[PDB]
Design an enzyme around this catalytic site. Structure first.
Site, short mmCIF file in Angstrom:
data_model
loop_
_atom_site.label_atom_id
_atom_site.label_comp_id
_atom_site.label_asym_id
_atom_site.label_seq_id
_atom_site.Cartn_x
_atom_site.Cartn_y
_atom_site.Cartn_z
N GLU C 117 -10.71 -13.69 37.19
CA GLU C 117 -9.86 -14.43 38.12
C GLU C 117 -8.39 -14.11 37.91
OE1 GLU C 117 -13.02 -15.66 37.23
OE2 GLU C 117 -13.06 -17.85 37.46
N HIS C 141 -5.79 -24.23 38.43
CA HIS C 141 -6.83 -24.57 39.41
C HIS C 141 -7.76 -25.60 38.78
CE1 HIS C 141 -10.12 -24.55 42.24
NE2 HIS C 141 -10.93 -23.90 41.48
N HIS C 143 -10.74 -29.05 39.93
CA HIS C 143 -11.55 -29.68 40.98
C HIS C 143 -11.18 -31.18 41.02
CE1 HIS C 143 -14.67 -26.18 40.78
NE2 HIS C 143 -13.46 -25.75 41.15
N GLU C 171 6.63 -41.79 44.60
CA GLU C 171 7.11 -40.62 43.88
C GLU C 171 6.77 -39.30 44.56
OE1 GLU C 171 4.77 -41.18 40.25
OE2 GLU C 171 3.02 -40.97 41.36
N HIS C 212 -13.36 -27.96 47.83
CA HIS C 212 -13.37 -27.18 46.59
C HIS C 212 -12.33 -27.76 45.64
CE1 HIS C 212 -13.42 -22.92 44.57
NE2 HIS C 212 -13.23 -23.83 43.65
ZN LIG Z 1 -12.98 -23.83 41.67
#
Ligand SMILES: [Zn+2]
Ligand SMILES: [Ca+2]
Ligand SMILES: [Ca+2]
Ligand SMILES: [Ca+2]
Ligand SMILES: [Ca+2]
Ligand SMILES: [Zn+2]
Ligand SMILES: [Zn+2]
Ligand SMILES: [Zn+2]
Ligand SMILES: [Zn+2]
Ligand SMILES: [Zn+2]
Ligand SMILES: [Zn+2]
Ligand SMILES: [Zn+2]
Lengths: 274, 274, 274, 274
Positions: C117, C141, C143, C171, C212
């Site tokens: 990645e 990244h 979830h 905020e 996702h």
């Molecule tokens: Zn993911």
């Protein structure tokens, strides 16, 4: 001995109160926990006791509890703090020969007011001793979140509420086949609510106080905590289901009957008939 | 050796059970976990074993498991307690040369009844061995909260339920392309539910027991836990979405097809056709 | 030196991944985290490096990243495990003089596939370097549960979604005045989604992948985590509000304008105009 | 002495901020906490102070706070980090003889801007000193999740909102009989919101900032945290109840009156009249 703070029962009280804190059941000083001990548990540690244990009379004598020691959370103490300072937040008490009062043997700075909820707990211990031929040793009160929420939306009726909890996790009928007794809302801390709770404890190991919380009994700290945790888990499932619009399907009466026969329990008749 | 409690597999069992406890999936004694080992795992520690390992016959012989060791959670034990006393709450067993029974090599105080759920687990291990050419080693049962709630509101059908879980997190089709098999509600602990679960394990790595919980398989503790955690995370997302009134948009069939091609998996046809 | 596992950046990677695990954002191997370092960070530890760091070419050269070291989570690794074995689950890489590839200096058993990645992350680091004159150093990244749920029920449009998040905690406009870019659903791991995410990173520090998860950038691990945590907290509030039937009142356009002026930020015009 | 980081008040600040972090109330730098000390608390540690404590003038002199020390969380600091580095994330300040400014005695790298929210906190400490004859010592601001959500769905009126919180857990009337003051939404950090909050603190120990959070006062860290936790627990119950379609039954006015008489408190008249 070793210090009493490392004893099985002080460590067990720390574990149960801490676990309940972590579950979100015991904000502030909400909740109380009492564990009936034997003399053999506390005897090695007697030189750790208060020099002159404070004596607190019981207005209502309880001869069934004569000579019986307990370890208890203090009145006004926070479950969160038990792990940080067990001697400040817990006490060991022993009922006298007549059941007319108790001595504070250890903890709580030897003060009376952190033992204020004991006469109510003691009434329920007495009924659970009789109902279980002495097996039950623990009374636990906590503010179990989903059970509380359900008391605003389900009928506050033993049969109906029991049945929903049985449906919300398969295990529940086997863990509490006698159901969950539901009182009317009552002012806490009163002789009235203590008597009413003890009366329900004759027939159930779990009692709910609408808009307030739960009161459970069992033979060990783990079994009592696990009893409450089982009911509260079912409640958590139910709150999700109700928030999604309600049950499309559920465990049937016929299935609940088959479950009770397989596990050799007698489910509370009124809850099963629904 | 070093003590067996510091072995990779005792430590792994502690991690998995503790993590499941912390997730809220394993109230009381809810859940069970079995891990297939090799002789080389346990051999260094043999002088730590019970002097005379207790023998437990299997009513249903399982020759595919001859001579195979496992580490298991005990029947009636609490996942929460595994970390506190692994030897009390876990056992190491080894199936005999005929698959006709097993010896309790270590743990559980060398007692039979904490191994009561093993014949059902063993049936599923056997089908997963065959289905995965020996790669799968773990069977895990837990009371995964959101998956349980969904069984009251979604159709309890493999295709339909699978499809919703695939939609509820992009990863799900890639992690469990074979889907989630959904049984009817059944009385737990019976030969019937053990056989039915093993039958579903032929075609799926995940099986749901409506109004009860989940049963998963995989090659390692982490992969099996992660499988369950993935399905349960999707379920958690779905419960939120359904509580907000349902999906306004979702992952399409066409997108799910493209996802499976990119990742080189074959998604369960019935769930994909919806 | 001291061992590199006690370095500020290994410890910081452990903290961030563990905290994200504890939030429930990183089931299984879901999520990835990359941190741009300086040579001075890693230089003391060079004799701890792999003897012969493995070289991995980049199909798409990135000269802006020439000679730049990073610490990264491995492909396929679980955030939960980083704290248990940082050297197995993290790698330190350094891009070469041409930006044509990178060497794996430390960790990951010196293997290529746990760095899969990185070319996508690197594309976003490049756009954030340009957009922030080199201040941003982190791409994260995860979830994030409530953000994911919201992508099934809100319009997946940058302006609309941004505006709701701004309303869900005061905020938010000050923390992400540039808003949250929302892509269409895309197959993960592809050149397409990596390019599209980097394109959004030109204009926003937060990007959402419908059904996702989220992708965030910032100057430090804490600021990047805190950015995501702020958006996810707002999302959590919103999911509760929507589950209760929707907003009765909210922060007005006029209030959001006053907030931005006081804090000296320029709120994304399209989201503010709603 | 021993180091000041092991002092009761540094340890207490760590506990409170960490507990609030763990509750999910303090994403990023959201929240602030100030504790009024006595000279006797800090005196043993004076040689640990900054050599030349930085002086910060107050634009608005506060002679009621002359010569008064406090321990505070820094502006921009994360509650999550207090436990990792208390000296970086906390400061000890002392107001001067005129109330015209304060010296930074310890922590915060002796920098001014992490003390930016102190003049607002100080205004509320002053009103709580007067209202409680000096008993209150703590001002705590956090982003209590369910309380925030409720401000989007309940009328943002002191009486109405108070009444619902009292109904959502039996204890609440006894813990905050004076109710919860609800301000209009206001731009944070302004003289206006600091004055308005202090004005509400004259009549209530809890103040809510719609679409933002809560501000509480009390005599100790535990009592102040517990106050907030009690209101937030009630809010959590209420969010569940409202998500399930609303109250079928609740605590009645008559019951709330009986509760207040038993516990010897005077419930806020407007909230009780509903
Ligand atoms: Zn993911
Ligand atoms: Ca009854
Ligand atoms: Ca099937
Ligand atoms: Ca954009
Ligand atoms: Ca007011
Ligand atoms: Zn209570
Ligand atoms: Zn009835
Ligand atoms: Zn089960
Ligand atoms: Zn079907
Ligand atoms: Zn748009
Ligand atoms: Zn705030
Ligand atoms: Zn009013």
């Amino acid at each position: 001995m070793q210090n009493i703070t490392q004893s099985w029962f002080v460590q067990g009280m720390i574990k149960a109160t801490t676990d309940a804190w972590l579950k979100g059941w015991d904000e502030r000083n909400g909740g109380n926990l009492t564990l009936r001990l034997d003399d053999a548990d506390i005897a090695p540690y007697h030189d750790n006791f208060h020099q002159q244990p404070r004596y607190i009379p019981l207005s209502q004598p309880m001869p069934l509890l004569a000579n019986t020691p307990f370890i208890v959370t203090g009145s006004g103490k926070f479950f969160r703090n038990v792990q940080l300072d067990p001697m400040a937040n817990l006490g060991i008490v022993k009922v006298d020969s007549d059941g007319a009062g108790y001595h504070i043997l250890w903890g709580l700075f030897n003060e009376a007011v952190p033992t204020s909820e004991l006469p109510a707990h003691f009434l329920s211990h007495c009924e659970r001793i009789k109902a279980t031929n002495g097996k039950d040793r623990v009374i636990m009160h906590c503010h179990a979140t989903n059970l509380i929420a359900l008391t605003y939306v389900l009928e506050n009726d033993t049969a109906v509420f029991t049945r929903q909890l049985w449906e919300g996790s398969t295990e529940c009928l086997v863990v509490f086949p006698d159901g969950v007794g539901i009182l009317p809302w009552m002012v806490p801390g009163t002789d009235a609510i203590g008597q009413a709770t003890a009366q329900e404890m004759q027939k159930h190991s779990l009692v709910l106080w609408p808009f307030h919380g739960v009161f459970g009994s069992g033979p060990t700290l783990d079994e009592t905590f696990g009893l409450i945790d089982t009911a509260e888990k079912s409640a958590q499932v139910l709150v999700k289901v109700y928030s999604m619009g309600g049950m499309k399907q559920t465990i049937s009466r016929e299935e609940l009957i088959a479950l009770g026969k397989r596990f050799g329990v007698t489910p509370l008749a009124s809850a099963l008939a629904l």
